[PDB]
Design a protein around this ligand. Structure first.
Ligand SMILES: Nc1ccn([C@H]2CC[C@@H](COP(=O)(O)OP(=O)(O)OP(=O)(O)O)O2)c(=O)n1
Ligand SMILES: [Mg+2]
Ligand SMILES: [Mg+2]
Ligand SMILES: [Mg+2]
Lengths: 698, 106
DNA sequence: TGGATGGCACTGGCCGTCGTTTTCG
DNA sequence: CGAAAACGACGGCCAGTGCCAT
């Protein structure tokens, strides 16, 4: 086994030069450094480890180092380099599995200070190395006199870079050892730093293998990217911007601008007494200014000529209140609230900090006498929605148009194990939060994401999209877990017609989507009021629905009961939270990992969300593997390409319809496989849609 | 009272087309300095009667005029002399500083 | 006692860098 | 010429609110 890391001139997409690398060999207990000209020797060594059926350990190597080495080996040495999956270990992947309850800085992309809770020490250091190095470089660049530009720190190799390169490895080695010492994932009778690759995977908790496969597959997906119709979203931005302009025109006309105190340093004091009056806006007593300026002539100095008048403005001693002129901003809930109250609106919902709630829900119900202002409300709601679309599609810091790459695709990031439950997280941008096809402008947004927007590299023909989603996943997960209580009744009934549509009819809801929001809100202990809000009624309609549905599957209580007994010893209830005494603070996931439980009231959700997340994770894995054992190639230069994974859904680009039909059928076989793999008490299924884009495929 | 209480709609002809000097006071009820210079203005209205006109404009009740003058602080005293701003001083000057402000501009 | 798990926009307060303007020593 | 002073466009940080999706 060996621990390694490299230093190059840029992130994966733009990297074109290997600066250096380091390898620690457990078989020799020694570090070896490689410089620019040692590149070939570096690759040899790594390949030597593979030849011995060994293991290579990288921290974030799966997403960066490995694919990068492949890219540089070709560009720089015109050599084919491809470390097999089974030979690679990633401590960032391991760290995220074992410390799932914790956050990390996604290798320096996020700010530690903005992250809640603690951060594992070794990983924190690794994620800050690029920044600490920049500081150390930007410093030596001042001691010598030169100035600093962009990110020159990475343009050329230097021994300062080499030193960090070495420390990364010594630090990655410690992290590796710390992680391996956890007896829950690695049996203690085995030295995992002295075993062949097949042994490392087979002797460790199934979870270790799954996570490394997911990460390997997902890094590939990132590289693939999601074919994006830049032009279309570009024209939509033009449409939305015009509409925002018109509403702003009407709104600023309906609600006039106004002034406000601003910049007041000193405090206003009573003239009579001297009593400071905090209530009054802060003031500013200038000490520079007068009627005329100081004399400039012999005449002025003598009074024979009026001194130059002072065009200053202020007059030393004369206190004034500085103010700013503000123009009505529809995006400011503070403004909306101010204007609406001045029109007779009386809020009936405030926040923890006493601020009157101003969301669409309350706006929807606001009523004022003035017809014009009353109508302005409908314009404010539109403006907010329009803005939301612009924010996400063009203007925000993570807007689609700011992330489309040269290859006409958006390479969103994925943290395969970013959520406690085992779900993944998505960002830059979050391709898992794209407006639903049925929401305002949903179709246009969704349609801009699609295989059709990618043209085959050889024929120039548009690719086809294959969309697959697990059917009623978490509800089938519930059925599995309560099977020991209802002997599989629910697991059987859930299969009589679509479950959500059926529930929709029973609850008399308007859409299937609304049945999904209801049932899950219900299953996870939403109060009567919230249930009302979800279905558009009140607390009574909520209590009704709770009984009506809990009455049907009373076993849900039994399950809830057992989860409580297994986790909690006893619990109280103070003034700012619940004080709990735990028997065990975690749940054993389907692949054996520990799944931290944050709260007793969320235990069931932790159980079912985790089961769904791990089922789906094993699923996308088995699916790609079946496609591959079928002779299909993963890549735009092949037959299919994973474009996105949205929890229990996958969107795959295909070279031809035929391939898309096979992908769809295969995903289905895969789902059933997984269900059999963990002896699930509820049959698992998936629904597949062939089409041009995301709007048609989900 | 001999002070003109303006409105956005009346401002133009009461001020910009008045013939003779006119001192406009852009104020707000929530400003301490404003409530201070007020009394002085009432007096300055009689003392300079015939020499100029003293008018007040409440920027809350009349938000459209002030913006045209980039008012950044209050109370603002804009001295008009035929549609044009003659002199401009901001702050709750004293009865003395004000008279010295006018005289030098009248 | 509670829907859950996440990303992320946008305002507004705090704070400090920084290029521009004015009357004065 | 620089210093003291009144400024505002400006970016990094952060808390509070609320919308995106599964
Ligand atoms: N408001 C929601 C919506 C969904 N989910 C969870 C549980 C199901 C999982 C995936 O969402 P869907 O794909 O909508 O789940 P589904 O019930 O399998 O939907 P379908 O059968 O329609 O595919 O996410 C949730 O916790 N809260
Ligand atoms: Mg690295
Ligand atoms: Mg689903
Ligand atoms: Mg889904």
């Amino acid at each position: 086994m060996i621990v390694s890391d490299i230093e190059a001139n840029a992130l994966l997409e733009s990297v074109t030069k290997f600066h250096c690398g380091v390898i620690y060999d457990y078989s020799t207990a020694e570090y070896v450094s490689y410089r620019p000209s040692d590149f070939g020797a570096y690759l040899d060594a790594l390949e030597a480890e593979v030849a011995r059926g060994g293991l290579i350990v990288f921290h974030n190597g799966h997403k960066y180092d490995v694919p990068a080495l492949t890219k540089l080996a070709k560009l720089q040495l015109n050599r084919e380099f491809h470390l097999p999956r089974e030979n690679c270990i990633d401590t960032l992947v391991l760290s995220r599995l074992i410390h799932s309850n914790l956050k990390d800085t996604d290798m320096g992309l996020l700010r530690s200070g903005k992250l809640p809770g603690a951060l594992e020490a070794w990983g924190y250091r690794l994620g800050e190395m690029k920044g600490e190095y920049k500081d150390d470089f930007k410093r030596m660049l001042e001691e010598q006199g030169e100035e600093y530009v962009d990110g020159m720190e990475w343009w050329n190799f230097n021994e300062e870079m080499m030193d960090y390169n070495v420390q990364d490895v010594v630090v990655t080695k410690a992290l590796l050892e710390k992680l391996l010492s956890d007896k829950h994932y690695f049996p203690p009778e085995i030295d995992f730093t002295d075993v062949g690759y097949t042994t490392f995977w087979s002797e460790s908790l199934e979870a270790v293998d799954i996570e490394h496969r997911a990460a390997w597959l997902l890094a590939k997906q990132e590289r693939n990217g999601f074919p994006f119709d830049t032009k279309a979203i570009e024209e939509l931005y033009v449409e939305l911007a015009a509409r925002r302009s018109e509403l702003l025109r009407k709104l600023t006309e309906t609600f006039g601008s106004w002034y406000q105190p601003k910049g007041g340093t000193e405090m206003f004091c009573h003239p009579r007494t001297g009593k400071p009056l905090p209530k009054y806006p802060r003031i500013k007593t200038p000490k520079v200014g007068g009627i005329f300026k100081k004399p400039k002539n012999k005449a002025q100095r003598e009074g024979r000529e009026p001194c130059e008048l002072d065009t200053r403005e202020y007059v030393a001693g004369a206190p004034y209140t500085p103010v700013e002129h503000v123009v009505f901003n529809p995006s400011s809930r503070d403004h909306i609230q101010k204007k609406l109250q001045e029109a007779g609106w009386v809020p009936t919902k405030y926040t923890d900090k006493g601020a009157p709630v101003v969301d669409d829900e309350v706006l929807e119900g606001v009523r004022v006498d003035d017809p014009e202002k009353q109508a302005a409300i409908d314009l404010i709601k539109e403006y907010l929605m329009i803005q939301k679309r612009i924010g996400q599609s063009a203007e925000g810091d993570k807007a689609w148009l700011r992330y489309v790459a040269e290859d006409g695709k958006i390479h969103g990031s994925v943290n395969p194990n970013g959520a406690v439950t085992g779900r993944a997280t998505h960002a830059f941008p979050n391709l898992a939060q794209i407006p639903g096809v049925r929401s305002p402008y949903g179709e246009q947004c969704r349609a801009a994401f699609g295989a059709e927007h990618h043209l085959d590299g050889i024929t120039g023909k548009p690719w086809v999209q294959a969309g697959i989603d697990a059917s009623g996943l978490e509800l089938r997960c519930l059925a599995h877990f309560m099977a020991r209580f209802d002997n599989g009744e629910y697991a059987h009934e859930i299969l009589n017609g679509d479950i959500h549509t059926k529930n929709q009819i029973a609850a008399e809801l308007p859409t299937r989507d609304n049945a999904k929001t209801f049932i899950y809100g219900f299953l996870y202990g939403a109060g009567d009021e919230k249930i009302g809000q979800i279905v558009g009624a009140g607390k009574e309609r909520g209590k009704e629905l709770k009984k009506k549905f809990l009455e049907n599957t009373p076993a849900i209580a039994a399950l809830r009961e057992s989860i409580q007994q297994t986790l909690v010893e006893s619990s109280q209830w103070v003034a700012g939270e619940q004080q709990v005494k735990w028997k065990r603070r975690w749940i054993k996931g389907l692949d054996g990992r520990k799944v931290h439980v944050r709260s007793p009231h969320a235990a069931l959700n932790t159980l079912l969300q985790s089961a769904g997340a791990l089922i789906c994770k094993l699923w996308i894995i088995k699916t790609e593997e079946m496609l591959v054992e079928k002779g299909l190639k993963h890549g735009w230069d092949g037959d299919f390409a994973y474009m996105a994974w949205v929890h229990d859904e996958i969107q795959v680009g295909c070279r031809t319809e035929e391939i898309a039909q096979v992908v769809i059928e295969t995903a289905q076989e895969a789902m059933r496989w997984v269900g059999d793999h963990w002896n699930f008490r509820c049959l698992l299924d998936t629904e597949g849609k062939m089409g041009p884009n995301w709007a048609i495929c989900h | 009272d001999k002070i003109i209480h303006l409105t956005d709609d009346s401002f133009d002809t009461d001020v910009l087309k008045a013939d003779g000097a006119i001192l406009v006071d852009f104020w707000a009820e929530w400003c301490g300095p404003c409530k201070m210079i007020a009394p002085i203005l009432d007096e300055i209205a009689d003392e300079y009667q015939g020499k100029l006109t003293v008018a007040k404009l409440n920027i809350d009740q009349n938000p459209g005029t002030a913006p045209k003058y980039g008012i950044r602080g209050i109370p603002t005293l804009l001295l008009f002399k035929n549609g044009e701003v003659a002199a401009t001083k901001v702050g709750a000057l004293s009865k003395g500083q004000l008279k010295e402000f006018l005289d030098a501009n009248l």
